[PDB]
Structure formats: structure tokens, C-alpha cells
């Protein structure tokens, strides 16, 4: 990317959700390992392998259950220059809470249940559905 590494990643993934390729790959900062170690665990994709040490870079495995593809409607919201630092008792539940809401907390990125369990919100990263 030039001027957001995480926004321009989220174009790269769901273009794989429009031709149903197997593996996708983007140049991977240490933040970017902490991105898809949430999407795997909540079940939206399957497996990933970092590789490279002068170009640290990922091998994400997609997940399309049918002709239907699992990662339906992912959206970045906090785009740079429009930071929305949510207080935690405003929190965006995604699609009546049926999805997950990736929030950049202190204690990590892994965020469904920061509403009650962790107990501190922050900058939204992206809605996920």
C-alpha cells in the first residue's frame, strides 16, 4: 500500500471472494499477522502461513463453502483521517450482532466480546460479516 496498509489489504482479500481462488497473498507487516489471526479463529477463513524475512509475507487460505463464499460483507470503517474512537457502550454490533466487530483494543485485535469480557473499546478496525 501507499496510504493505508490495512484498507488496501481489504481490497485484496474479497477480490478472492469474487473469483474463488484458493490462496491469497499480501506483503505482511507485523500488524498484518495480527489481522488474520482473528479471521481464522472466528472461522471466516481457514489457514495462513507467514513466509519471507526480507519480504515478510502471508499465504492465506480462503474459505468458500459452495458457489457461495463464506466472508460475505466485510467493510473497513475507520479509514485514516476519519478515526471513530468508540466508547465501549456504543459498540457496533455487526448485523444485529450476528457477525464480529474487529476493534483495536489495548489487549489485542481479537474482538467479538470486548463488550463484556475485556471491557475496553478503541478504534474500530473493520466490521466483518
Amino acid at each position: 500500500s501507499m496510504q493505508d496498509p490495512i484498507a488496501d489489504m481489504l481490497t485484496r482479500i474479497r477480490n478472492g471472494q469474487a473469483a474463488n481462488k484458493a490462496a491469497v497473498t499480501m506483503p505482511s507487516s507485523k500488524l498484518k499477522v495480527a489481522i488474520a489471526n482473528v479471521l481464522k479463529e472466528e472461522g471466516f477463513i481457514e489457514d495462513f502461513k507467514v513466509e519471507g524475512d526480507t519480504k515478510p509475507e502471508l499465504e492465506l487460505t480462503l474459505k468458500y463453502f459452495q458457489g457461495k463464499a463464506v466472508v460475505e460483507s466485510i467493510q473497513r470503517v475507520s479509514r485514516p483521517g476519519l478515526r471513530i474512537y468508540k466508547r465501549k457502550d456504543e459498540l457496533p454490533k455487526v448485523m444485529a450482532g450476528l457477525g464480529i466487530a474487529v476493534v483495536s483494543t489495548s489487549k489485542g485485535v481479537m474482538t467479538d466480546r470486548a463488550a463484556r469480557q475485556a471491557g475496553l473499546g478503541g478504534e474500530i478496525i473493520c466490521y466483518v460479516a
Binding site: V70, E72, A96, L98
Partner: protein, 149 residues
């Protein structure tokens, strides 16, 4: 059984070498009150024969849509080719606070508790296409959980 409903009827003309031959259109939907809905379209040269042919158009091609509590549960946005439809799930006992064409498709699904809005164009041919796409895109909590894990 099923349940019909009209939408409208126009004053569709035509032009031949002689004069102005008219026609009539007939927009209907069909849905049994349990979740499956369908629609059709049919013309004629008079009024009542148009309905008769368009009513069978909807008695096939009824699409499978699941409901939750006589209502929707999660806010899909529906758009089809001229118009935007914004359906928010709401409480029980709320009526279908809705505009034109989607009233006909919601009181045939079994849907009875939705507040919703038509956002842009108000042309009832293209409105009734969108909300059927709006209910097509939805997912029940079974479709949530069984697909992700």
C-alpha cells in the same frame, strides 16, 4: 394454499401505421404465509385477462426465504436497478411500517413486524424486485453458525 395481491395497472400504448393500440400491465406477487414468496408479470389487451396470466407466473419461481418470528432479524439493505430499500428488524406487534410494493411481499411471506423505508425512486415496478433480493440475501442463525463452523 397461496395468497395473491395486485400492485397496479398502467395505460400502456403502442403505435402502428393505423393508430394507437393500447394494452394493460399487471404486477402481482404470490407467497404462502410461511416464508416462500414469488412474483410475476403479465400483459393483455384488456384488464382482467392480464391478471389471470400473470398470476401463474408467480405460482412458479417462488424463492426459499426463512423467517424468524414473523419478522426479520438482521438489517439487510436491498437494492435492485432503480431503488434502495432499507429494512431494519423491529419489535413484535409493530406493523409493517412500509411504503408501496414491499407491503405486498411482506404480508405474503409471514413477515408482520418490520419497519422499513424506500430510499430513492418510488416506481413500483422496480421496487418489488429489490425487496425479494433483500429477503434472498438474508441468513438465519443456523445459516450463521453452520456456515462458519
Amino acid at each position: 394454499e397461496l395468497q395473491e395481491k395486485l400492485i397496479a395497472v398502467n395505460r400502456v400504448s403502442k403505435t402502428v401505421k393505423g393508430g394507437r393500440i393500447f394494452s394493460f400491465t399487471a404486477l402481482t406477487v404470490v407467497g404462502d404465509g410461511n416464508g416462500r414468496v414469488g412474483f410475476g408479470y403479465g400483459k393483455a389487451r384488456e384488464v382482467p385477462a392480464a391478471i389471470q396470466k400473470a398470476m401463474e407466473k408467480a405460482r412458479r419461481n417462488m424463492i426459499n426465504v426463512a423467517l424468524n418470528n414473523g419478522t426479520l432479524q438482521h438489517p439487510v439493505k436491498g437494492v435492485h436497478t432503480g431503488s434502495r430499500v432499507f429494512m431494519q428488524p423491529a419489535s413484535e406487534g409493530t406493523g409493517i411500517i412500509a411504503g408501496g410494493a414491499m407491503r405486498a411481499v411482506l404480508e405474503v411471506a409471514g413477515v408482520h413486524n418490520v419497519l422499513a423505508k424506500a430510499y430513492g425512486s418510488t416506481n413500483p415496478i422496480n421496487v418489488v424486485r429489490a425487496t425479494i433480493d433483500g429477503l434472498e440475501n438474508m441468513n438465519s442463525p443456523e445459516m450463521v453458525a453452520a456456515k462458519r463452523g
